Design an enzyme around this catalytic site. Structure first.
Site, PDB file in Angstrom:
ATOM      1  N   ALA A  88     -28.319 -13.563  19.052  1.00  0.00           N
ATOM      2  CA  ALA A  88     -27.892 -14.375  20.195  1.00  0.00           C
ATOM      3  C   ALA A  88     -28.295 -13.580  21.439  1.00  0.00           C
ATOM      4  O   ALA A  88     -28.138 -12.349  21.452  1.00  0.00           O
ATOM      5  CB  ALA A  88     -26.389 -14.581  20.131  1.00  0.00           C
ATOM      6  N   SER A  99     -19.641 -20.925  29.236  1.00  0.00           N
ATOM      7  CA  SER A  99     -19.096 -20.082  28.183  1.00  0.00           C
ATOM      8  C   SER A  99     -20.138 -19.976  27.079  1.00  0.00           C
ATOM      9  O   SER A  99     -20.316 -20.904  26.289  1.00  0.00           O
ATOM     10  CB  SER A  99     -17.797 -20.679  27.618  1.00  0.00           C
ATOM     11  N   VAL A 100     -20.848 -18.856  27.048  1.00  0.00           N
ATOM     12  CA  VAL A 100     -21.847 -18.598  25.989  1.00  0.00           C
ATOM     13  C   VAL A 100     -21.143 -18.458  24.647  1.00  0.00           C
ATOM     14  O   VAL A 100     -21.651 -18.867  23.607  1.00  0.00           O
ATOM     15  CB  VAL A 100     -22.711 -17.361  26.335  1.00  0.00           C
ATOM     16  N   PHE A 153     -24.096  -9.203  11.823  1.00  0.00           N
ATOM     17  CA  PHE A 153     -24.021  -7.789  12.132  1.00  0.00           C
ATOM     18  C   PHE A 153     -23.946  -7.664  13.656  1.00  0.00           C
ATOM     19  O   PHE A 153     -24.908  -7.987  14.351  1.00  0.00           O
ATOM     20  CB  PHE A 153     -25.286  -7.066  11.604  1.00  0.00           C
ATOM     21  N   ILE A 173     -24.519  -7.771  29.879  1.00  0.00           N
ATOM     22  CA  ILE A 173     -24.637  -7.133  28.564  1.00  0.00           C
ATOM     23  C   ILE A 173     -23.279  -6.597  28.080  1.00  0.00           C
ATOM     24  O   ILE A 173     -22.671  -5.743  28.719  1.00  0.00           O
ATOM     25  CB  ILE A 173     -25.718  -6.003  28.565  1.00  0.00           C
ATOM     26  N   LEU A 174     -22.796  -7.131  26.964  1.00  0.00           N
ATOM     27  CA  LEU A 174     -21.532  -6.637  26.372  1.00  0.00           C
ATOM     28  C   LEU A 174     -21.755  -5.306  25.663  1.00  0.00           C
ATOM     29  O   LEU A 174     -22.786  -5.134  24.980  1.00  0.00           O
ATOM     30  CB  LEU A 174     -20.930  -7.665  25.404  1.00  0.00           C
ATOM     31  N   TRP A 182     -16.008 -10.384  20.817  1.00  0.00           N
ATOM     32  CA  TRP A 182     -16.606 -11.653  21.180  1.00  0.00           C
ATOM     33  C   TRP A 182     -16.962 -12.469  19.938  1.00  0.00           C
ATOM     34  O   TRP A 182     -16.559 -13.632  19.805  1.00  0.00           O
ATOM     35  CB  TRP A 182     -17.855 -11.343  22.042  1.00  0.00           C
ATOM     36  N   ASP A 249     -32.360  -7.392   9.999  1.00  0.00           N
ATOM     37  CA  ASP A 249     -30.951  -6.977   9.960  1.00  0.00           C
ATOM     38  C   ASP A 249     -30.840  -5.488   9.647  1.00  0.00           C
ATOM     39  O   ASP A 249     -31.604  -4.976   8.812  1.00  0.00           O
ATOM     40  CB  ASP A 249     -30.212  -7.783   8.897  1.00  0.00           C
TER      41      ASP A 249
HETATM   42  C1  LIG Z   1     -25.514 -11.051  15.784  1.00  0.00           C
HETATM   43  C2  LIG Z   1     -25.937 -10.714  17.090  1.00  0.00           C
HETATM   44  O1  LIG Z   1     -26.710 -11.429  17.722  1.00  0.00           O
HETATM   45  S1  LIG Z   1     -25.385  -9.245  17.865  1.00  0.00           S
HETATM   46  C3  LIG Z   1     -26.454  -9.108  19.375  1.00  0.00           C
HETATM   47  C4  LIG Z   1     -25.792  -9.756  20.608  1.00  0.00           C
HETATM   48  N1  LIG Z   1     -26.805  -9.933  21.679  1.00  0.00           N
HETATM   49  C5  LIG Z   1     -27.007  -8.921  22.530  1.00  0.00           C
HETATM   50  O2  LIG Z   1     -26.380  -7.857  22.477  1.00  0.00           O
HETATM   51  C6  LIG Z   1     -28.036  -9.178  23.621  1.00  0.00           C
HETATM   52  C7  LIG Z   1     -27.448  -8.811  24.998  1.00  0.00           C
HETATM   53  N2  LIG Z   1     -26.177  -9.487  25.381  1.00  0.00           N
HETATM   54  C8  LIG Z   1     -26.088 -10.737  25.819  1.00  0.00           C
HETATM   55  O3  LIG Z   1     -27.064 -11.489  25.942  1.00  0.00           O
HETATM   56  C9  LIG Z   1     -24.667 -11.214  26.204  1.00  0.00           C
HETATM   57  O4  LIG Z   1     -23.847 -10.094  26.692  1.00  0.00           O
HETATM   58  C10 LIG Z   1     -23.898 -12.038  25.137  1.00  0.00           C
HETATM   59  C11 LIG Z   1     -24.736 -13.211  24.635  1.00  0.00           C
HETATM   60  C12 LIG Z   1     -23.477 -11.164  23.937  1.00  0.00           C
HETATM   61  C13 LIG Z   1     -22.639 -12.570  25.788  1.00  0.00           C
HETATM   62  O5  LIG Z   1     -22.963 -13.314  26.961  1.00  0.00           O
HETATM   63  P1  LIG Z   1     -21.914 -13.521  28.100  1.00  0.00           P
HETATM   64  O6  LIG Z   1     -22.642 -14.218  29.146  1.00  0.00           O
HETATM   65  O7  LIG Z   1     -21.245 -12.223  28.381  1.00  0.00           O
HETATM   66  O8  LIG Z   1     -20.880 -14.499  27.377  1.00  0.00           O
HETATM   67  P2  LIG Z   1     -19.659 -15.425  27.799  1.00  0.00           P
HETATM   68  O9  LIG Z   1     -20.040 -16.565  28.635  1.00  0.00           O
HETATM   69  O10 LIG Z   1     -19.077 -15.758  26.492  1.00  0.00           O
HETATM   70  O11 LIG Z   1     -18.720 -14.432  28.613  1.00  0.00           O
HETATM   71  C14 LIG Z   1     -17.989 -13.372  27.971  1.00  0.00           C
HETATM   72  C15 LIG Z   1     -17.147 -12.629  29.038  1.00  0.00           C
HETATM   73  O12 LIG Z   1     -18.018 -12.064  30.047  1.00  0.00           O
HETATM   74  C16 LIG Z   1     -17.664 -12.610  31.327  1.00  0.00           C
HETATM   75  N3  LIG Z   1     -18.928 -12.738  32.052  1.00  0.00           N
HETATM   76  C17 LIG Z   1     -19.926 -13.606  31.834  1.00  0.00           C
HETATM   77  N4  LIG Z   1     -20.909 -13.381  32.705  1.00  0.00           N
HETATM   78  C18 LIG Z   1     -20.532 -12.362  33.486  1.00  0.00           C
HETATM   79  C19 LIG Z   1     -21.125 -11.668  34.552  1.00  0.00           C
HETATM   80  N5  LIG Z   1     -22.326 -12.010  35.020  1.00  0.00           N
HETATM   81  N6  LIG Z   1     -20.462 -10.635  35.114  1.00  0.00           N
HETATM   82  C20 LIG Z   1     -19.254 -10.291  34.675  1.00  0.00           C
HETATM   83  N7  LIG Z   1     -18.656 -10.929  33.668  1.00  0.00           N
HETATM   84  C21 LIG Z   1     -19.283 -11.951  33.060  1.00  0.00           C
HETATM   85  C22 LIG Z   1     -16.985 -13.933  31.036  1.00  0.00           C
HETATM   86  O13 LIG Z   1     -16.036 -14.186  32.053  1.00  0.00           O
HETATM   87  C23 LIG Z   1     -16.230 -13.606  29.769  1.00  0.00           C
HETATM   88  O14 LIG Z   1     -15.072 -12.880  30.172  1.00  0.00           O
HETATM   89  P3  LIG Z   1     -13.651 -13.167  29.496  1.00  0.00           P
HETATM   90  O15 LIG Z   1     -13.769 -12.559  28.023  1.00  0.00           O
HETATM   91  O16 LIG Z   1     -12.688 -12.198  30.357  1.00  0.00           O
HETATM   92  O17 LIG Z   1     -13.302 -14.607  29.498  1.00  0.00           O
END
Ligand SMILES: CC(=O)SCCNC(=O)CCNC(=O)[C@H](O)C(C)(C)COP(=O)(O)OP(=O)(O)OC[C@H]1O[C@@H](n2cnc3c(N)ncnc32)[C@H](O)[C@@H]1OP(=O)(O)O
Length: 364
Positions: A88, A99-100, A153, A173-174, A182, A249
């Protein structure tokens, strides 16, 4: 409940989006887990299909998700399906709050609603027979209500599907802990919304003691989460005979490392989890976790996706070309997000007489 309906239900009210839902032609392949000689029954067939999704807003791609579905057949009445949630990613070029998390949840809910027979109707044979006839396809049947597994994973990276998108200051980026929570939330909701109460729900954090894993699980709403995994303990719990081997993976990456080291008969499941962690450790260390669900759906899956739900290119070449417009683009500027959208839209129109699907959000 169509993919359009699902996505609209979680997208902000009155806001416009488009989606691409792309799917490979189902293919007969090798078993998910490496077979052993002591298995009294092996799969008759394993059918692999890729679903690839992209969401667009205001003429720019901003989110993508790669999912594989494996249907394993033992006979006419015995089957399993497994949903491997591969990657993702976001690129930060969405100018509105979405909300992603819920987008990702709802796409998986859509995939769970698909009748596994949908993938069995026209299956491309593995090269090893069937032979010379070019337009020959296999077909199988199975029950609609089959054991359903979901595997993923968690491991953060700056990107997986959007090259150089971490250069966009808007990309969120989380970290590894946040990312585990998440996905944890997403799966917890899938369990409550889509699975029966007798379902296995498993979490492990390789290299960590179960006490801290157990700690987190206490906040889940699904009442049957446990520390561990959904894997078997065949062949004296040898890792090779129990670990599923998925595209790109980390588990399969480590199995292949053990293969190169000639240690596949030496490494138990317990050592696998320790070593998987151990030998990729210091400066690149981030929290990673493995999550697994195994059980039956609350609602019998009976959907055969329409052309509005999914686009299935006539060839792997076309599938690859379309996916490459996302993954092969550069996202250090917004121009990459614009170009990905225009290339895809033009390709679909020009080569397939198809539109990206339009959505208006319904969530208040
Ligand atoms: C199996 C796998 O795929 S694991 C690999 C996961 N992918 C990656 O690591 C690639 C890099 N990461 C990303 O692309 C992203 O961080 C993702 C897809 C994991 C999550 O995307 P997000 O946009 O953060 O998701 P989402 O809309 O669900 O928001 C999650 C939290 O971040 C907050 N948030 C979203 N955008 C922002 C932003 N720009 N600045 C600060 N906070 C933000 C939201 O408010 C939410 O907070 P809450 O939990 O307090 O309600």
């Amino acid at each position: 409940m169509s993919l359009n309906d699902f996505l609209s239900s979680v997208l902000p009210v009155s806001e416009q989006f488009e989606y691409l839902s792309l799917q490979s032609i189902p293919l007969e392949t090798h078993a998910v887990v490496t077979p052993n000689k002591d298995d009294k029954r092996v799969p008759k067939s394993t059918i692999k299909t890729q679903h690839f999704f992209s969401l667009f807003h205001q003429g720019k791609v901003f989110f993508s998700l790669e999912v594989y579905v494996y249907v394993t057949l033992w006979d006419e009445a015995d089957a399993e399906r497994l949903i491997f949630v591969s990657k993702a990613d976001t690129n930060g070029y969405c100018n509105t709050r979405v909300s992603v998390r819920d987008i990702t949840k709802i796409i998986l809910e859509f995939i769970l609603s698909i009748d596994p027979n949908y993938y069995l109707q026209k299956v491309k044979p593995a090269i090893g027979g069937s032979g010379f006839q070019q337009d020959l396809y296999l077909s199988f049947t199975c029950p609609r209500e089959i054991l359903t597994k979901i595997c993923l994973f968690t491991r953060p990276a700056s990107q997986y599907l959007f090259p150089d998108s971490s250069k966009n200051s808007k990309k969120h980026i989380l970290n590894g802990e946040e990312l585990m929570k998440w996905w944890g939330f997403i799966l917890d909701r899938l369990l409550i919304e889509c699975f029966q109460n007798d379902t296995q729900a498993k979490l492990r954090i390789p290299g960590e003691d179960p006490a801290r894993v157990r700690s987190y699980l206490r906040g889940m709403k699904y009442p049957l989460w446990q520390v561990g995994d959904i894997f078997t303990s065949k062949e004296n719990s040898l890792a090779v005979y129990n670990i599923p081997l998925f595209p790109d993976d980390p588990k399969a990456r480590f199995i292949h490392q053990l293969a190169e080291e000639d240690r596949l008969l030496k490494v138990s499941l317990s050592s696998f989890w320790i070593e998987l962690q151990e030998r990729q450790e210091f400066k690149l260390s981030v929290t990673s976790s493995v999550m697994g669900i195994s059980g039956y759906s609350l609602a019998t899956p009976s959907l055969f996706p329409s052309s509005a739900d999914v686009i299935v290119p006539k060839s792997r070449k076309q599938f690859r070309a379309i996916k490459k417009y996302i993954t092969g683009e550069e996202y250090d500027t917004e121009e990459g997000a614009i170009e990905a959208f225009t290339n895809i839209r033009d390709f679909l129109l020009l080569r397939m007489a198809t539109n990206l699907q339009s959505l208006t959000g319904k969530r208040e």
